[PDB]
Structures are given as C-alpha cells and as structure tokens.
Write a protein that binds this DNA or RNA. Structure first.
Ligand SMILES: [Mg+2]
Ligand SMILES: [Mg+2]
Ligand SMILES: [Mg+2]
Ligand SMILES: [Mg+2]
Ligand SMILES: [Mg+2]
Ligand SMILES: [Mg+2]
Ligand SMILES: [Mg+2]
Ligand SMILES: [Mg+2]
Ligand SMILES: [Mg+2]
Ligand SMILES: [Mg+2]
Ligand SMILES: [Mg+2]
Ligand SMILES: [Mg+2]
Ligand SMILES: [Mg+2]
Ligand SMILES: [Mg+2]
Ligand SMILES: [Mg+2]
Ligand SMILES: [Mg+2]
Ligand SMILES: [Mg+2]
Ligand SMILES: [Mg+2]
Ligand SMILES: [Mg+2]
Ligand SMILES: [Mg+2]
Ligand SMILES: [Mg+2]
Ligand SMILES: [Mg+2]
Ligand SMILES: [Mg+2]
Ligand SMILES: [Mg+2]
Ligand SMILES: [Mg+2]
Ligand SMILES: [Mg+2]
Ligand SMILES: [Mg+2]
Ligand SMILES: [Mg+2]
Ligand SMILES: [Mg+2]
Ligand SMILES: [Mg+2]
Ligand SMILES: [Mg+2]
Ligand SMILES: [Mg+2]
Ligand SMILES: [Mg+2]
Ligand SMILES: [Mg+2]
Ligand SMILES: [Mg+2]
Ligand SMILES: [Mg+2]
Ligand SMILES: [Mg+2]
Ligand SMILES: [Mg+2]
Ligand SMILES: [Mg+2]
Ligand SMILES: [Mg+2]
Ligand SMILES: [Mg+2]
Ligand SMILES: [Mg+2]
Ligand SMILES: [Mg+2]
Ligand SMILES: [Mg+2]
Ligand SMILES: [Mg+2]
Ligand SMILES: [Zn+2]
Lengths: 60, 204, 74, 147, 96, 123
RNA sequence: GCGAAGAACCUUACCAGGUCUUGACAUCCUUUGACCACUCUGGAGACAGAGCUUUCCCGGGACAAAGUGACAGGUGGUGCAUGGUUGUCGUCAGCUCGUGUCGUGAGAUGUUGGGUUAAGUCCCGCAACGAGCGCAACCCUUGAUUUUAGUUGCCAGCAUUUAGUUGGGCACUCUAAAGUGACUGCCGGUGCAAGCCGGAGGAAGGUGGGGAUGACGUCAAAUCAUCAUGCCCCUUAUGACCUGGGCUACACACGUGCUACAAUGGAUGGUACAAAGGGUCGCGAAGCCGCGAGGUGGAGCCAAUCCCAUAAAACCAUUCUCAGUUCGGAUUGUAGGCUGCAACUCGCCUACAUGAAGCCGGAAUCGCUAGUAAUCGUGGAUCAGCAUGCCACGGUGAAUACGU
C-alpha cells in the first residue's frame, strides 16, 4: 500500500482540505519544501550533484 | 565518519552548477523538468558515453548541450539521432530543444565514463581486484595526479560483504583548489547491489 | 459552527427525520429543536448506540452521548 | 584548566566614587543581566549609609572590609582514601571574592522590606563589628580553628 | 530615463555583464548612472542529514541573489535602439 | 568621528563651543535618563583636558541604550584625537581608540543556544 | 520535544462495517473516436439509473473510451544477505610509501629518546635520508581601513513641511566588488635552538572570535518505513475503493520543556532604543463597528520605496506593605471570535465568573570559561487552519580556575 496512494495525492479530491503535498520524485509525504517540491532526502541528494542552481553549501 | 561529496562542496567556489537557468516564481515547473529532461537523455543515449548534460533555458526556449566521449555516435554523418532526439526532448519540454554535443578529450578523466569501464566489466562476472587495478594503472598513464577506485558491496559472491579499493599518487581532498572529479554507479549484478566509486585528482 | 452565523445538520439526518427507528450513520449533526421524540442511531466505530433525543439534550453534537473507548476499570 | 594559572579582570571603575570595590559588590548583586536594578540600589544604599552613619559613604563601605575578609579557609584535602578538613590560608582571591559574597549571601538576614536599605544596613552592621556577615566570618574561622 | 535591474546568483557574472552595458551606455550617452549595489538576499535551508533518527545532525545550504540596477539620466534615441540588441550570460536578469 | 560598538553606531561632529553634548536632535539628559552611565562619555574629554570646550553633536542608529554609550564614547575619542595629534598619546592608552570587538554569537544546530546544549542523562 | 519542517477529515500504514477483480495506478493489442464535464433519485459515501452529450488535428499523428490475457499490485518477511545514506570513538592526531641499513625469518628502523605545541606542530640527539593522505594554510562571516558606484539608502552644507516631506548633493553612514592590514614582526630576559615570560605600536597579539572541512578504521551500530535491490510469501487478497473510528485511552514509573512559589515584585498610566527574514494570486494599510478575539474597507507593493510591524526586559510617577496575599495561575460554568463540507471523541484564541498546588524543592544529578551562561522579545520552514518544539536574529550581561 504505497504506489496506490500517489494517485490519491494526484487526483483532485472532493474538498480542498483533503489535498496535501508530497515529494515530486519519491512520493514521500513528510517534509516537502514548497519552493522545490522535493522532500528532504531528494533535495540534498541533488544539491551535491548540482541540479538545483544557486544553492550551495553555506559555511556562513 | 563519512566523507563529504567532493563535488557537493566544490560547487560555486571552483565549479558551477549543472544547470544555468534563472527563474522568478516559475522554478518549480522549470526545476522538475531539469530533472526529467535529463532522464530521457539518460537512457536514449545511454551507450554514447554521456557525462554532463548542462541544461540552460531562456526566453521560452531550452538548450541542453550533451557532452559525450563518443561524439560521432549521437550526431554526425547519420544526422538522425540529433533530429530524432529533437522530437523527444521537445515533445516533453513543449518548446524548442536545441542540443549541441561537446566532444570529450582524455576520456580517462571523466569519472562517470571512467567508472563505467569498471561497472560493465564487473557485471560481466570479472574479478573485483583485477577490474580496478587493470584500469587504475591504465588511467594512471593519462596524467591524473591521483586515483581512488573502490568497489564496495557483497563482493566476490560471498555471503558477507566487504570493501576493496586501490590508489596511486596524490589526491588532496581537504585542499579546496583541487579540480577533483567524482562518480558513483550501480553494478547491478545478478545477485545483488555492489556500486563502485571512482574519483580522479587532476591538473591543479 | 461555533459562530453565531450558522447552524448545520449533516445533509440528510434532518431530511429523514423531517418525514419520520432512525440510523443516521456518521456523527456530528447536533440535535436541533425539531427532533425531540425521534430516537436516532449514531454510529460509534462499531455497533449503533441508541440515544433518544429529549428536550433537554438539544443543541449538543449528536455524537457526545455514545462513548468510543471502553475503559471498565484499570 | 590542567595547564597553569589564569588572571581575572573584574575591572571597570564606577561613575560615582570611582573604585573597584564598588564596581565589585555591584556585579555580585545583579541577577540575569540586571545591572540597572543593582546600580541604583548600590547607590541608594550609600545614600542611607552616608546619612544614618554620618561619615563618608566610601570609608563606611570600606570600614566593613577587615570585618568580613576571611583568614583561614578549611580546605578539603584528600588523605586516606577520603576527604577531610585541612585548614589553609586563603589568598587574595578567596578574600575579596568570599568577602563580598558574604554580604549578599546574607542579604536575607537584614530583615528589611527593600534592598535599598537592606544592603545599607548590613554594611553598617558589619561596620559596627556586629551583625551576621562578621559573625559569618568568625564562624568560618571557628571551624578552621578546630583543625 | 530608463531603469534596468540585474539579479544574478554569482557576483562575477553579473558585475562583468553590467560592466559591458555600462560601457555601451557611455558610447550611446555620456549621462550614465553607473552600476550600483543593493543589499543581497540570503536564504537558508536546514535539511536534516540522517535518513532516520539522530535529530542533531543537519546540513545548511544557502542561495544568494546579488542585485544591481542601472538607469539613464538624459537618454537619446540610441538608448532604445542600442539596448535590446545584447544577449547576456544565462543567469543575468534583465528588466527595463 | 565615527564609533561602533555592538550593533549600534554613532557618528560625531565636534566643534568648539559651550559644552552641551547634544544627541540625535534632542538633549542628552532627555535622551539618557541615568546620567551616571553618561559620565563615561566624558572620558574622551576628561582624559584630555577639553571637558567643556566643544559642543558635541551626535547621530544615533541601532543597538540598545547601553549600546550607544560605548559607541559615542569611542565616536568622539576618534575626533578629539583628530583635532590635535597631541591627544593621541593619552587617548590611545586609556582604551578609547580601541573598538570593542565582542559581538553576539551564531546559534549552532544541535544546541539550544550558541554555546549551551540539551540536558544530559545516562541511564 | 526521537523519523513526524504541522495526527479533526486527508495524511494513516491500524480497527469495524460496506464494496472491486487485467484491478485505482504502467507497457503489449484490437473495435471506437479527442474522452470529459452537467442535472434528477437513492443511499454514509464508495457506486447504480436516466438525458444533452465531449463539435480531434494533419492514410498518418498526440489523448481517450470499451474488449481477454503478459501482467500488474504489496509501508508483507530477512538491515546477521546488500547498494546506499548515516551516526559515535572524534576534528581525537594518527595511517603509510620509496631508496638505504639490521634480522636465516615473519619483521624492525624511519614514526623510539630530551624539550615544545592546539597537533608525528617544531627543534636537538641518533642507521637513516626523504615523501603521500591526515594537522596547519587555501574558503565563509565578524572586528579597522583605500578606491570604485551613489538609489529606493544617507542629509552636513542651503533653505523649505505635521513629518527626509520638496528642490538639491553623494560630505558623513550604509550597501558591495576589487585591495591593505597580524607574521612572535620589533625590544628585554631565558633557551643552543624550538619555544616560553614581559613591553611598544596597532582597530585587532600570540591559530583575534566563530563556521564549513571529519584520515586508517570500530561497533554484524541505525534504517528493506525515502529511493533501489538478492531471496521468500500473498496475487478473487497480506492487493484496491469509502464512511466512521483509533493514532490524543489512564490506576501508575521514567526523559526533555513551559509557568510559578513574590518587594531586584505586582497593579495603573506615560514612555525610549533592535537585528535578521517573508510577501502575487500573496502581504494586506487608513477610516468605520466593536471591552473583546475580530468583521467591513481597500491604499501601497513583483519591494534598500509599500506591507507583515506598536518588540518586550529597561525607565519615570501613584498605589500595594510581607498575607496561599493586590503572587500564582490550573480547573470548571456561561457567553463569544477565526478556518474549514465539519472543531462531539479531538483545534487556536477573547470577556465575565470560578479560583486549586506552590511559600525555593531529599539522597542524587545537568550545562556552561565571555558577549559565555541567565533572562526578555522577533522571524522562517511545514502550514485552509493549529508549536511551551525545531531552525535563525537581536536587547540586558555576570561568577571562579590554587590544582590533577
Ligand atoms: Mg493539511
Ligand atoms: Mg574495513
Ligand atoms: Mg575538493
Ligand atoms: Mg490503566
Ligand atoms: Mg557532521
Ligand atoms: Mg593613532
Ligand atoms: Mg558545545
Ligand atoms: Mg515519536
Ligand atoms: Mg544489509
Ligand atoms: Mg532493529
Ligand atoms: Mg555527540
Ligand atoms: Mg640481510
Ligand atoms: Mg604510529
Ligand atoms: Mg587538533
Ligand atoms: Mg584543515
Ligand atoms: Mg578572519
Ligand atoms: Mg573609502
Ligand atoms: Mg564616494
Ligand atoms: Mg605583547
Ligand atoms: Mg581563529
Ligand atoms: Mg573554528
Ligand atoms: Mg561540525
Ligand atoms: Mg568490522
Ligand atoms: Mg552491519
Ligand atoms: Mg542495539
Ligand atoms: Mg517494515
Ligand atoms: Mg536510490
Ligand atoms: Mg532513485
Ligand atoms: Mg504520538
Ligand atoms: Mg498529541
Ligand atoms: Mg523531568
Ligand atoms: Mg525577585
Ligand atoms: Mg508575572
Ligand atoms: Mg532587516
Ligand atoms: Mg510581553
Ligand atoms: Mg520583566
Ligand atoms: Mg495577580
Ligand atoms: Mg476551581
Ligand atoms: Mg473546577
Ligand atoms: Mg475564593
Ligand atoms: Mg488569583
Ligand atoms: Mg478545583
Ligand atoms: Mg572549551
Ligand atoms: Mg523559505
Ligand atoms: Mg511535536
Ligand atoms: Zn523524495
């Protein structure tokens, strides 16, 4: 009971409240940063390789 | 203690990002495409030794210059795949897709290509120690100041997993001016997962 | 709605009670001043606990009366 | 610190009657960054101690110096697989540090209503060679007298 | 009497690009309001390291936006003609 | 003159005059209630004998009430010295041309505060 | 105060009841063509039944409906089978190689010995002489300063308005690109030297303060529940759809926080000084109705301009006068506001009322060496709504280090 539910995230529900957000590569429900639509683990794994522009490691 | 990704912390100090495309409130649409327009290119031209696909977009038109070690395979006398992939890339990005290949030099310096020389061989049931050492010495002739190939996993068909590697020369990671490459591929053997890791110090 | 600009029953409990035991399935549909004298059956996650809407228990959410956790001593 | 000694600072001469025995006891007064609460109090205590006693507020405040400064601090020396009470001679560190600690640690014993006079009464009380702060000094030397 | 705003992630690419149009502005018109800095936006994303527990290990990325704006004081007909004819490095932001 | 301390900055113009140390388009005793902390501001004018010889104009931005007191002291101590170089041989010794380098500290992840940490219990 | 950077529903993996079979969801094919969307009845909906109906484009092309299967479909098992990704020892100072030399040999020396250091850092002495990954340095931010560009920031010279408002100027600040500056550099003692004790000068003095960076490897350490994968099991159910419910239950024991037990305080009025961030289908001002939480209204803004946004501790006057109180605020009744189809189980807040334990905490135990601890506020991520938690920002600012 996992790949069934991505269709539940995708389809427009009968109430705006039902609708939530999940990662757009691996459908992880928690911790999805809206400026990217990526979960925490997708977001970091692309930043190292460097797909996300602008983002870089912040010493300070 | 686990290392850092020797690319993931060189970005923006000695190396740019694999995508140069500014966006204002439209990043989520552009960024998700800059992760899938790099997947159709990943399988369609899988055997053409493609290393970097730097997507740059501007003015409702996208440019994806694919850098390959076999430049004549993607484009050239046939003149068909470039036109053929112009249909597939544009059928996804819903706009112009201008691709201009870049021809690699000193092929044993691109880590992705260098570790695919040891990722197919290991999948063809060869020796772990021989596979790395036969090519570690091979690329060492090119001019790399260092090397480190490791083949980590349930190596050798055993029931207990262990790590193996090699090296030759200088490869200072903790110096930020090092031009160090890196790659990591999946040796999808018939029995499990064994992914290799390769990286190459270079000129300066 | 705790706001004074509203007072809602589910969609049909009022309709079925309007003509008219009663078994309104879910919950949540506070007994208005038009249902005293018509016993309903508000479901409880299992079984249908029977409650008779009197004049005193008017306004309260229909669910309250049927408990949900069975705790018969420690 | 497992490596040598260190030297301390505690030095900022105060605005009125510039000294470092009055910017100290004004720093051993405050709680959670309340320099302003203490500084006014530590100058109002002088105001009542300069009237009800007559003499100079500074000399009256320093009059209770020799009546609060400890002389022998019973040290906890490790002998025979335990700790005992081996008296020793306190240095200048534990003289003024202890000495000005004795007052404020005994500011619940003046029994007034406000700290403006309570700190003013205790300084005079020790300045009379009486009160509890001097008794506390004599109490410490008493347990140091046994050993 | 125009105003152009530059918004690029790397200060090297934009400040070089602005050093080009500011030169072309001088040829088009002596009265040029040269490049000028504005405070740079910073944002931080404190993503957590471990795939599972160990709540005390995270890793912080950042994303700047270096800004610069160029204007015109008493422009001429060359300004409208000679401005749009340039393409800047991909990343530089143009808005007149 | 110009003097910083903590997050507050004070820029000082010093001209000969009566001696009214004005601050930020208001009288200083209005602007600072506790005059006893305002006497140190006269240290750059009492260590060199120029107490009531110049009227001090000040501009104030940021910090806290004690935050400017350290900056205005420094902010004039770099101007009285510039009036005549004879003032440096004593204004550069009392600790006035020095700029206090202490500032607040970043908060590091895994820690409640900058240097604090959670509470520790073994078992 | 752990995955969970948001458990009313959804998320939800769990229970009860009710429903589907090539399946809700992909690829192979055929007959239809662009399929949908909409109204009426029943139901808790999942779903059934009626109607207009979806007017494709250029034989081909995308997308769809209907017809049997190959198949799908598993947040089902094994982290003592794995990729990964991580943690702790630990930012501890180690792990090695080439040429020589000793040993029959595995091997040793270098890397031991005396000092010194934060450090196999550095020196001296020795059958060793050198070197590589680690330490230090390169990188980021803060502390002084030069040049450049001066607006939307700044306002001295000039006046002008209730107001930096207006002309006007980039002087000062400040913003941000390229540079300077600190290295035991100089002087005294000491040392053979490394270095150690002190002094000038300088914004800054002994790696100035703080980040990023984590060697060889240890724990068969954590995760098959992020993704992927070896092998096994279910495959008209261990798959799939809905409504309700549990995830918040309570006789108790333990971990991390919040608020207090009062006079360095409470109550009332006045009143002053921030830093860092967020805003387009978003921030939402002024006025107006309100004790009230809020509602109506729509100004300005794709922002150094406008908004979120009046910061509180501090301070100045009156009152309280050492009481379970003019402290404390749990608990409960009534009456209300917000979002959302819906606040009963189970959200947040407001008024009146109610007013409980607590009068500085046993043996024991925790954090921190300076802008530190303590204490008072603000912003962001997730987010229709909900944080005493988490990630960041500032204001007030201490005490002691003899010693192992
Ligand atoms: Mg939600
Ligand atoms: Mg190993
Ligand atoms: Mg590197
Ligand atoms: Mg029980
Ligand atoms: Mg780490
Ligand atoms: Mg000087
Ligand atoms: Mg710490
Ligand atoms: Mg938990
Ligand atoms: Mg495993
Ligand atoms: Mg386990
Ligand atoms: Mg730790
Ligand atoms: Mg031999
Ligand atoms: Mg060793
Ligand atoms: Mg070290
Ligand atoms: Mg280092
Ligand atoms: Mg520095
Ligand atoms: Mg300058
Ligand atoms: Mg200038
Ligand atoms: Mg010195
Ligand atoms: Mg340092
Ligand atoms: Mg550091
Ligand atoms: Mg760290
Ligand atoms: Mg092991
Ligand atoms: Mg293991
Ligand atoms: Mg264990
Ligand atoms: Mg599991
Ligand atoms: Mg994966
Ligand atoms: Mg993947
Ligand atoms: Mg829970
Ligand atoms: Mg809860
Ligand atoms: Mg506890
Ligand atoms: Mg108190
Ligand atoms: Mg209170
Ligand atoms: Mg700000
Ligand atoms: Mg408050
Ligand atoms: Mg307070
Ligand atoms: Mg009260
Ligand atoms: Mg009660
Ligand atoms: Mg009650
Ligand atoms: Mg009562
Ligand atoms: Mg009360
Ligand atoms: Mg009660
Ligand atoms: Mg320490
Ligand atoms: Mg954000
Ligand atoms: Mg929580
Ligand atoms: Zn993901």
């Amino acid at each position: 009971a996992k790949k069934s539910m991505i269709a539940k995230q995708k389809r427009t529900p009968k109430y705006a409240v039902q609708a939530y957000t999940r990662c757009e590569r691996c459908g992880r429900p928690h911790s999805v940063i809206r400026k990217f639509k990526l979960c925490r683990i997708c977001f970091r794994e692309l930043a190292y390789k460097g797909q996300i522009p602008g983002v870089k490691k912040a010493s300070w | 203690g686990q290392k850092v990704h020797p690319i993931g912390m060189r970005i923006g100090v000695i190396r740019d990002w694999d995508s140069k495309w500014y966006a204002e409130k439209d990043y989520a649409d552009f960024l998700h495409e800059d992760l899938r327009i790099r997947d159709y290119v990943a399988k369609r031209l899988s055997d053409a030794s493609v290393s970097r696909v730097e997507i740059e977009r501007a003015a409702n038109r996208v440019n994806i210059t694919i850098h390959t070690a076999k430049p004549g395979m993607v484009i050239g006398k046939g003149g068909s795949e470039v036109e053929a992939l112009r249909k597939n890339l544009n059928e996804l990005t819903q706009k112009r897709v201008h691709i201009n290949i870049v021809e690699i030099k000193r092929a044993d310096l691109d880590a992705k290509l260098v570790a695919e020389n040891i990722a197919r061989q290991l999948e063809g049931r060869v020796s772990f120690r021989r596979a790395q050492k036969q090519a570690i010495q091979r690329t060492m002739r090119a001019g790399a100041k260092g090397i480190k190939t490791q083949v980590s996993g349930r190596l050798g068909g055993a029931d207990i997993a262990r790590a193996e590697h090699y090296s030759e020369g200088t490869v200072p990671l903790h110096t930020l001016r090092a031009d160090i490459d890196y790659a990591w591929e999946e040796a999808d053997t018939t029995y499990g997962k064994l992914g290799v890791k390769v990286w190459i110090y270079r000129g300066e | 709605r705790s706001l004074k600009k509203g007072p809602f029953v589910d969609d049909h409990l009022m309709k079925k009670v309007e003509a008219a035991v009663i078994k309104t399935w879910s919950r949540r549909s506070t007994i208005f001043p038009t249902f005293v004298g018509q016993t309903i059956a508000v479901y409880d996650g299992r079984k249908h606990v029977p409650v008779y809407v009197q004049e005193d228990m008017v306004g309260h959410k229909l669910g309250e009366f049927a408990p949900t956790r069975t705790y018969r001593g420690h | 610190p497992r490596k040598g000694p260190v030297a301390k600072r505690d030095v900022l001469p105060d605005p009125i009657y510039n000294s470092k025995l009055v910017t100290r006891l004004i720093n051993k007064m405050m709680v959670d960054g309340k320099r302003g609460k203490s500084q006014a109090i530590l100058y109002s205590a002088f105001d009542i101690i300069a009237q009800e006693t007559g003499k100079d507020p500074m000399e009256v405040f320093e009059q209770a110096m020799k009546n609060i400064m400890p002389l022998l601090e019973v040290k906890a020396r490790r002998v025979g697989g335990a700790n005992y009470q081996v008296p020793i001679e306190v240095r200048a560190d534990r003289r003024s540090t202890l000495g000005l600690r004795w007052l404020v640690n005994y500011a619940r014993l003046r029994g007034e209503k406000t700290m403006e006079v309570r700190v003013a009464r205790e300084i005079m009380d020790a300045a009379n060679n009486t009160g509890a702060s001097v008794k506390k000094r004599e109490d410490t030397h008493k347990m140091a007298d046994a050993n | 009497k125009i105003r152009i705003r530059l918004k690029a992630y790397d200060h090297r690419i934009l400040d070089q690009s602005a050093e080009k149009i500011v030169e072309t502005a001088k040829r088009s018109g002596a009265s040029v309001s040269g490049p000028i800095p504005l405070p740079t936006e910073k944002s931080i994303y404190t993503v957590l390291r471990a795939v599972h527990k160990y709540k005390d290990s995270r890793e912080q990325f950042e994303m700047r936006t270096h800004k610069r704006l160029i204007d015109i004081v008493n422009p001429t007909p060359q300004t409208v003609d000679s401005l749009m004819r340039l393409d800047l490095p991909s990343g530089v932001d143009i808005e007149i | 003159g110009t003097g910083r301390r903590k997050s507050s900055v004070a820029r000082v113009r010093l001209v000969p005059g009566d001696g009214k140390i004005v601050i930020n388009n208001r009288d200083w005793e209005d602007y600072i209630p506790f005059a006893a902390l305002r006497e140190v501001i006269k240290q750059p004018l009492v260590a060199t004998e120029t107490l009531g010889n110049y009227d001090v104009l000040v501009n104030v931005h940021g910090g806290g009430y004690t935050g400017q007191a350290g900056a205005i002291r420094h902010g004039v101590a770099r101007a009285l010295l510039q009036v005549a170089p004879e003032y440096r041989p004593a204004l550069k010794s009392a600790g006035l041309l020095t700029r206090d380098p202490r500032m607040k500290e970043r908060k590091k992840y895994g820690l409640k505060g900058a240097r604090r940490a959670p509470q520790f219990s073994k078992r």
